Design a binder for this molecule. Structure first.
Ligand code: W9Q
Length: 134
């Protein structure tokens, strides 16, 4: 057993708060915000050795990242930003920092009860997205 065991699995979005405002702060345009905000993604997390894979699948977009903790990688986000990403484990929380155009956002994934809670922060704006097992 290991590092991310309690994250592995297939998760479905069940609630969201402040996500439109978060996306505005990030710079996402109107039409993408509307369509992305309607999506109810499945988040599929798996581990093979040191490599973690996170897939996000929805009617809007399918994304996939694979990474090693602490090791920067280039990512194309669902809104087509070209970012440089680093994901670490900090006290049992997966902390994902995205850097682009002198900007930064941080996405935290934590296990809380039977949920996987996501907190997305861009300057002063936080969005909370709650996922349950599918
Ligand atoms: C786990 C969350 C994280 C990643 C994705 C996901 C989610 O719940 O979809 C979402 C996101 C994002 C940004 C722009 C667009 Cl257009 C769509 C998603 N930024 O942060 C959150």
């Amino acid at each position: 057993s290991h590092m991310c065991d309690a994250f592995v699995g297939t998760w479905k979005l069940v609630s969201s708060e402040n996500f439109d405002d978060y996306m505005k702060e990030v710079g996402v345009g109107f039409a993408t915000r509307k369509v992305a905000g309607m999506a109810k993604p499945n988040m599929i997390i798996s581990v093979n050795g040191d490599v973690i894979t996170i897939k996000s699948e929805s009617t809007f977009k399918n994304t996939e990242i694979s990474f090693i903790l602490g090791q920067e990688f280039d990512e194309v986000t669902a809104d087509d930003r070209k970012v440089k990403s680093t994901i670490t484990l900090d006290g049992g929380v997966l902390v994902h920092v995205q850097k682009w155009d002198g900007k930064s956002t941080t996405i935290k994934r934590k296990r809380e009860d039977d949920k996987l809670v996501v907190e997305c922060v861009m300057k002063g704006v936080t969005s909370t997205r709650v996922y349950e097992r599918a």
